[PDB]
Amino acid sequence: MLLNSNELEHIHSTNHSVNDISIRWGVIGAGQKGNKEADLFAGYKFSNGTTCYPTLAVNFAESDMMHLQNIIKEDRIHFDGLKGAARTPSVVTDLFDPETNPNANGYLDKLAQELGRKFTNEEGEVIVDQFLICLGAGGGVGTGWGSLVLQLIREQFFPCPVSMLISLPSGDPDEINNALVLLSEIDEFMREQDRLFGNSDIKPLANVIVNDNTQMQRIIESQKGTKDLKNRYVNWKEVANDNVVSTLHEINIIPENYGSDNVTYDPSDLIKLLSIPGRFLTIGKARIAKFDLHSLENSIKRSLDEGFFSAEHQFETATMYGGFVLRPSNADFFKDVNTENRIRNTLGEYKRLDEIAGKFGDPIWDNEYAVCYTIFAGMTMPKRYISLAREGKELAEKQEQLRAEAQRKQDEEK
Amino acid sequence: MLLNSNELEHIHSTNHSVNDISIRWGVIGAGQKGNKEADLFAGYKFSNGTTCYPTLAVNFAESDMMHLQNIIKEDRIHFDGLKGAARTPSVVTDLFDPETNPNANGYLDKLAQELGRKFTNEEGEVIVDQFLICLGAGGGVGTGWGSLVLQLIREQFFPCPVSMLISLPSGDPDEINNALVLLSEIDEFMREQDRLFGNSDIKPLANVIVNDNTQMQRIIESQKGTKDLKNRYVNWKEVANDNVVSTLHEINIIPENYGSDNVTYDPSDLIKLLSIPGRFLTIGKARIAKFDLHSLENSIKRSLDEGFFSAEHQFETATMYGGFVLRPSNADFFKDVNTENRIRNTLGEYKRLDEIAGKFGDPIWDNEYAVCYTIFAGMTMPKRYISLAREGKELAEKQEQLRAEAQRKQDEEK
Amino acid sequence: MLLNSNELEHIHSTNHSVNDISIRWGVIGAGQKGNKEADLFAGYKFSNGTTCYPTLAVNFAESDMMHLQNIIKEDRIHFDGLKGAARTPSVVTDLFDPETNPNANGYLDKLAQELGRKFTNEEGEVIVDQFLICLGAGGGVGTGWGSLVLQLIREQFFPCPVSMLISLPSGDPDEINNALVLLSEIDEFMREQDRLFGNSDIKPLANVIVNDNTQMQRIIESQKGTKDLKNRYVNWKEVANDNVVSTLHEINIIPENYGSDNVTYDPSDLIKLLSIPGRFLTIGKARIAKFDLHSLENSIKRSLDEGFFSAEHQFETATMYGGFVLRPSNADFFKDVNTENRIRNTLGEYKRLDEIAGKFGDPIWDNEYAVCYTIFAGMTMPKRYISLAREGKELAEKQEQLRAEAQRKQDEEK
Amino acid sequence: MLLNSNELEHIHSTNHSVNDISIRWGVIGAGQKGNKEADLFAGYKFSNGTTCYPTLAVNFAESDMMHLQNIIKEDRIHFDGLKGAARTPSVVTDLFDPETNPNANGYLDKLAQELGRKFTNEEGEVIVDQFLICLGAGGGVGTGWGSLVLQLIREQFFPCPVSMLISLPSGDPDEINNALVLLSEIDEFMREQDRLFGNSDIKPLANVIVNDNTQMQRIIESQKGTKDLKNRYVNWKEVANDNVVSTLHEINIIPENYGSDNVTYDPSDLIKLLSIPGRFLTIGKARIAKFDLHSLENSIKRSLDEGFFSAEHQFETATMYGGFVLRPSNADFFKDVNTENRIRNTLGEYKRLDEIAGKFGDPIWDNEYAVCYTIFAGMTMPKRYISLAREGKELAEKQEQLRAEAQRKQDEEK
Ligand SMILES: Nc1nc2c(ncn2[C@@H]2O[C@H](COP(=O)(O)OP(=O)(O)O)[C@@H](O)[C@H]2O)c(=O)[nH]1
Ligand SMILES: Nc1nc2c(ncn2[C@@H]2O[C@H](COP(=O)(O)OP(=O)(O)O)[C@@H](O)[C@H]2O)c(=O)[nH]1
Ligand SMILES: Nc1nc2c(ncn2[C@@H]2O[C@H](COP(=O)(O)OP(=O)(O)O)[C@@H](O)[C@H]2O)c(=O)[nH]1
Ligand SMILES: Nc1nc2c(ncn2[C@@H]2O[C@H](COP(=O)(O)OP(=O)(O)O)[C@@H](O)[C@H]2O)c(=O)[nH]1
Predict the structure, then answer these.
(1) Which segment of the chain is annotated as a signal peptide (chains A, B, C, D)?
(2) For residue C204, which of C148, C166, C245, C164 has the smallest C-alpha distance?
(3) Phi, psi for C142 (deg, rounded to 5)
(4) B407: distance to nearest CA of chain D, Å?
């Protein structure tokens, strides 16, 4: 268990029966980023110190996996032999493709194996609910795997659905491409399946969660760090991560361990919520320590807008909503209805919930502020896609410039 | 005086007439643990810096007693000669048993003596109320003494009753046994006496207070320690201890030095409370800084459940209740009756108080939160006993496994 | 972006759309002081980390400009050749005066140039609103430039108005003089223009903001610094500065990014406010975390009196008022009218606002206290001028004393 | 007393009551190496300059024993007559075997005798705890004796157990053989006894400590010697030795003379530790002067891996663990629990301690760094055995080559 939020604390300080989750994610962490996250996920144990999620970490080589603080070598999968690579994801693919790599398959086995190892007990049962695959884009490894997975799922190695945690980078046109295309492909896929399935079907691809780094850094600095001191010694990712994960984590806990005396969110919701939309999903966590409609709105707005996962996704491309407000039970001001209404309406502004599926919870806690967790799902494409698009152009060219300028510098010299 | 709680502080900051206790415990601290505790007890002095409890520390050898910060060598009793021992408590027994150790008696004298030294003044009067013997189980020394005491009491060396502070360890089947049996014997004894006495009789064995380490550690980490920094440098016991003792300590102080404008707990209560049940006793200290019935309940629940002394004792095997809520006098919300009722009822759920003896206090302070001290007494057996039972089996076997597995490893090699 | 106030934080934590200012100051920082400030100004970037003001730093030589943390050499203008100088501002003047320095003009070009560089984009457009020239008096460089500017403006190199940030020193008669005369000249100028213009005219000299160091230090120590620890390691200027700038800075932000649900201050106001009075302007920022008329008054009073910019300026020599209270929107106590009235009246005591121009805002925030920004403009002469006058006399003579005394010491010895 | 480590110093500088050991080794030093070591052991005296271990030195002839700096001729046992020998250990055996050497026995007597002389006082009591026999392999003398001992023990001349200090050489196939076989035999023996005994039995062969020279030299040079100057004049063994012995030595001292305020290692542990595993034992001493989990790990790792005694022994062939960290008592960072855990886990990676016996201490000192002594016991076979195996083949053949090549050189010439 790693608390790392007031909240978390609050929780933990309060309940200690926390031994219980909603969804058994099978954390496969790929690439620096993923791994890194994974360790955090890894950090969760219960109120009996029992891990929460089961986690494999993958990376190409061993060394790659040294700084992990929870992962053991066994869970450090790597495939090794050749030194160096071109960070093309095409390396990866090879290694499992007979044609390039005959022993392709050899590897696969071991994956299948370790999967077995890790995800069976001895019922041979998969002890997983959905695969949570974590990726940071531009990471060859990730990218390679990404696709890989798509196949694999098909190839039934994966019989749980996949949830994709994708970070959208910042800069570097190359990455941009890699990413975009990656996203594209996915997107296709996404599109295919709904019409390939019904639309009430378990989506093998449950949803996609994206994060923008850029945005985040900005945010991060926003939040200053004279509010603490070691802040003054931190890395943004390091923080970022915390939030991110925590959120997720948290929300998994909360319904499970909490109740309300009024509307009750629940796992199933989540399940629903997570599977079926199949697409782009976003979450807003809003501290609410100030108590009025206007501010409510603000923080709402803020939370959405100045959401952490925010990517300028196109709200009305959502189809489904969710979230809940964990509110103190003495917090009358919320008990009031107007509020609710207000809220409703508030949200309605980005698209009216009431045209789509979703629900909302309002749990109790005994905190001294409330946090509103908000989730919009099944969206398609965030405008960032575009922005990215534009930007890498605006980059590409920008160093074309630099290329031409200084091609001139060649000419200019004897 | 060592404060080490807000409370304690609060107290101390408030009253300074604290020169006064309810019960004169005679702290005999046996074994690492006991000693350690003892030092803390030892740390108490009055508002005139006058010690609170008188304390002997026992250990086998001198060195054993070095790190103590309050104990003087004089109060470091040890009996020495042979180097090393098997940590069998059977060592101890010998030393006072003529048959094994002829000079058995020689020692006894010195005990009797130092007891004299320490517990008489020069009225020859025992300046004690009840012996508080502190033990951590699995400690040969403790264990040896434990039994020893039973005899000794009989042997009238002890003319105050004994209260046993027992820690129940965590792991190691051996200990487990030692313990269990120890507990067993005690248990017997306990059983005997009530029927050996009346049931309205001064129980020579006033009660037993157990603590589970395991539980505690868990708890401890629960309580995080980013709430403080040096926390980030602490040992659980170190904290644990603090609580534990403090509690006790505290509660001894409080009635004595406090009043109420309503129901008044008092020493006698305590006395009653402590003597007669003769058996398993538990305490819940509940911060109440949140003010509603539900939360009241929660914290109640919490406190019981996620009590510190908690061991899954069998509530209805209690016979007697007590405790008090030290509440701020401006704290109207408590003044209200409903509350009381509520409380009553709340407790009623684990067994209905109103079928048994006990009482309850509600003192004032001028704190800005309240703490509810809750005591259930005269219980018999906590399910942990069992759990322990199961566990050591689950251990024993588990390393039988390891024994057989690797007996195989012998066979497997040439 | 550098936050450095709760407020700032509050702001920043709240809005992150802060990408937007009211007035584009063109910060020219002259002399140690100015530079220093400039760096701070320089520290501002937006919610997209986009600088706020554009800034040139001037100093005589390069080295002079080393410790700057944001200024780049390019923005470190210096003119160099001769080593040492007499800190006469008459050095400066020379350098741009053909007669003394034929290549006078050469320099000017570069100024004009860098001005170009810095203040055009490629529309050749000036990207500035008003020049904010920062000076600490007694600084030869500053002083030289001061005058220089007056000319330059005339000489149309400056086509934005100038706002002068002048610090009034503490001690040293020489400085005093330099200053006074400087002030005098300015004063003249000020006087001229109004009658040289209409009085409804864009004043090329928008206003003057003075700061007294002396006063400030006093204040500073007032504010203690056990309230923080590093305080215990600070320099007054360092703090001072922070305030000062911040204030300014802040106020530029706030209207721009904030609204109210009631009276709305706005840039134009500011503009008006800043241009037309042409003269002495002062600002009071009042935390209001205590909620009553009396205290309101107090803090008001305090703020004025024990304003930061305060110089014993002659209120009724003002002609124009402004400011706004950034108040929490839940802060009902302000919503109330009486309050307003009260305020009005309060201010009325130093001169009645209602005889002059100005306005006042009351924005919302969601802070948990309010800050009242108060501005009195178009004043002429603060009594400090005088005080200064007296003091340097009281100095001059005082070391005349010392001169005569110890001229005696010459005589007294063989 | 010879200090020769900071530590040792630290110790000695601190305590001077050092008059006290854990285990009375009876140092029999055989062969150059052993002797050499012995002298060092010999160098230990107490804080009252009282020798620590009692030591016989054996060698074949007198001259052999000249450079010893502590050994007296009396303790220079040699058996002499014939000049030269074939360094076959078979020489040795003869000398005590009636059949080859009738007067075999004559010698034996003298051994028995001097043993008597040296190891009785006049209680006729053996003043020994365990025989510490030191050997460097390939040393005929050693080797001969090795076996000899096995018999002798059986032959009850030895009634203390034997601990074998074996150096594994570097190169020379012959040695290799001699060694291997030696090791083999031993190994057998080892295997026999456990099944010959119970497994909870005092192993007559307490354990085996091996050292690799090769490894060591490498290490040695690693540690540079511009860190000192005379280093620049040293022999590796000379250093090596120091460490080695010292370690041992040290660890014998430390528990004995130190305490902790927390977990306490102790002799018994050692005893246990040393006797019962009967097999391969290894030790890691880790300076810890850097304070974080990662580094902790590192040094841990390092220490294990880049242990001094390290031989690529097969961790999981261990059965038993031990060690302790002598840490400064002000060293909070260790006091913290996480740490502990971490550690635990860390170790767990090579095999999980928690499946096997052992314990761990954490003593105080007042050093300004900590040293972690780590012990893995009861292992069987280190991969070096193998490596050796391979290598001598790789040698044997390699000079077969040279043999054939240059057999060709014969043919090639007339
Ligand atoms: N925020 C964050 N991004 C990371 C982290 N590690 C890597 N990334 C990002 O993930 C993307 C791909 O890099 P990486 O994960 O190293 O890919 P790899 O080279 O395939 O291992 C880049 O945008 C990295 O900045 C991480 O732990 N957190
Ligand atoms: N929490 C706690 N347990 C302790 C302390 N010292 C020892 N123990 C525990 O007491 C039990 C018996 O150990 P110990 O007191 O050393 O017994 P001894 O060997 O007879 O001195 C074990 O569970 C120890 O962990 C202490 O000061 N606090
Ligand atoms: N508060 C403050 N005053 C300063 C600072 N630097 C210089 N001054 C003051 O400005 C006045 C003129 O000094 P300076 O700026 O060094 O002039 P220069 O010699 O022309 O560079 C003096 O009163 C200095 O104390 C600064 O950064 N802050
Ligand atoms: N490190 C070390 N090895 C030694 C020393 N003396 C001898 N050896 C080694 O011990 C092994 C056997 O040689 P030695 O002791 O001379 O055997 P002997 O010929 O029977 O006396 C070889 O590997 C030697 O290098 C010593 O004092 N230290």
Answers:
(1) none
(2) C164
(3) -55, -70
(4) 10
CA distance B408 to B400: 12
Q: Which two tokens stand for residue D43?
A: 């160098």
| Residue D25 CA from chain centroid, whole number | 12
* Long-range contacts of A12-15, Cβ-Cβ distance < 8 Å, separation of 24 or more: A12/A47, A12/B222, A12/B224, A13/B222, A13/B223, A13/B224, A14/A365, A14/A366, A14/B298, A14/B302, A15/A47, A15/A257, A15/A258
Cα–Cα distances (Å) from A266 to A23, A279, B321, in that order, read 11, 20, 39
Q: Hey, how many other C-beta atoms are within 10 angstroms of the C-beta on B147? A: 16
Q: Output b/e per residue, A386-411; b: 16+ Cβ within 10 A.
A: ebbeebbeeeeeeeeeeeeeeeeeee
Q: Which two tokens stand for residue C404?
A: 């005569």
Is C105 annotated to bind a ligand? Reply is no
For CA atoms D30, D36, D37, D40, give the dihedral sign.
Answer: positive
Instruction: Report the interhelical angle of C338-348 vs C293-305 (nearest 10°).
Output: 30
SS3 for D141-189 is HHHHHHHHHHHHHHCCCCCCCEEEEEEECCCCHHHHHHHHHHHHHHHHH
D195 part of contact set with chain B, CB < 8 Å = yes
Output the CA–CA distances (angstroms, integers) from residue B248 to B301, C41, C181, in the order listed: 20, 59, 78
Is the separation of the CB atoms in D163 and D274 below 8 Å? Answer: yes
Min Cα–Cα distance to chain A from C148, Å: 40
Q: Is D33 annotated as a binding residue?
A: yes
Number of Cβ within 10 Å of residue B211's Cβ equals 23
Spatial separation of the C-alpha atoms in residues A302 and A290, rounded to whole Å: 13
- What is the CA(B381)–ligand 2 centre distance, in A? 22
The pair of structure tokens assigned to D175 is 């040695």
Indicate the residue type of C44: Y
Could you tell me which of D208, D302, D303, D252 has the C-alpha nearest to residue D41? D252
Structure tokens at C63: 């080295």
- DSSP structure class, residue D61: S
Q: Do B63 and D268 touch (CB under 8 A)?
A: no
Under DSSP, the state recorded for D315 is: G
**Reduced to 3 states, what is the DSSP secondary structure of residue C21?**
coil
**Ligand number with the minimum distance to the CA of B88:** 2
CA distance readout (Å), C273 to C23, C75, C159, C204, C407: 12, 30, 19, 13, 54
CA–CA gap between residue A127 and residue A123 (Å, rounded): 9
Give chain B positions within 8 Å (CB) of A47: 218, 222
Residue A324: helix, strand or coil by DSSP? strand
Q: Is B320 helix (H, G, I), strand (E, B) or coil?
A: strand
Report the gap between the CA of B238 and the closest CA in chain D (Å): 10
CA nearest to B380, candidates B312, B331, B328, B287: B312
Q: C48 among the known binding-site residues?
A: no
Q: Does A262 touch chain B (CB under 8 A)?
A: no
Burial of B102 (0-12, 13-18, 19+ CB in 10 A): exposed
CA pair distance B134, B119, nearest whole angstrom: 18
Q: Ligand 4: which residues within 6 Å by Cβ?
A: D 31-33, 36, 87, 136-142, 167, 169, 213, 237, 240-241
Paired sense of beta strands C280-288 and C205-212, if any: parallel
Can you tell me which residue has the tokens 């505690």?
B216
Q: In this structure, are residues B276 and B203 in contact, taking their beta carbons and an 8 Å threshold?
A: yes
Closest among A70, A376, A374, A340 to A251, alpha carbons compared: A374
Residue among B221, B294, B302 whose CB faces A329 most closely? B294
Environment class of residue C298 by beta-carbon count within 10 Å: exposed (0-12), middle (13-18) or buried (19+)? middle
Residue C81 makes CB contacts below 8 A (sequence gap 6+) with none
Strand partners, B28: B56, B133
Give me the count of residues in chain D: 414
Give D-chain residues touching B84 at CB under 8 angstroms.
266-268
Which whole-number Å values give the CA distances from C274 to C153, C282, C326, in the listed order? Answer: 17, 11, 20
Compute the distance between CA of residue D79 and CA of residue D81 in angstroms, rounded to an integer.
7
